[PDB]
């Protein structure tokens, strides 16, 4: 029984890369686990899920190294995942680029932006007031 569990761990390290593959996953992500891959995403995100594993198992949505120009290799948050989070990550069942694609509108942006923070290109408020004009001329 103990030999079978040890063989499953060794096969898991052999699956995702190897000596350099599993070590890159252990340092960047919290835990390394092998599963079936979805693959297709704008700015190469892995999103290898489909496994039964445990509770709420839409597992391992690995973030892309430099999505727009942030160089997310050592530090990465939930700023990634372009319009696919509702199906492959949270609520729905079918995979967004495999079974059920979102309908085209020709208004939505092709490239998804990162999180708005203290960096430039941040949010700012404005008013639509035309103002009461004052007339004074010589």
């Amino acid at each position: 029984e103990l030999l079978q569990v040890l063989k499953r761990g060794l096969q898991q390290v052999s699956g995702h890369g190897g000596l350099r593959g599993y070590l890159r996953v252990l340092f960047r992500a919290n835990d390394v686990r092998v599963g079936t891959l979805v693959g297709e995403d704008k700015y190469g995100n892995k999103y290898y899920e489909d496994n039964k594993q445990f509770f709420g198992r839409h597992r391992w949505v690995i973030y892309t190294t430099e999505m727009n120009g942030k160089n997310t290799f050592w530090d990465v948050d939930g700023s990634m995942v372009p319009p696919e989070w509702h199906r492959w990550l949270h609520c729905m069942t079918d995979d967004p680029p495999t079974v059920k694609p979102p309908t085209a509108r020709k208004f939505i942006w092709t490239n998804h932006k990162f999180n708005l923070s203290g960096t430039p290109q941040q949010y700012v408020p404005y008013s639509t007031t035309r103002k009461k004009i004052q007339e004074w001329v010589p």
Partner: peptide
């Protein structure tokens, strides 16, 4: 403890 393996209807 987890208990979310089978009979959990998505969508």
């Amino acid at each position: 403890l987890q208990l979310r393996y089978q009979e959990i209807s998505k969508r």
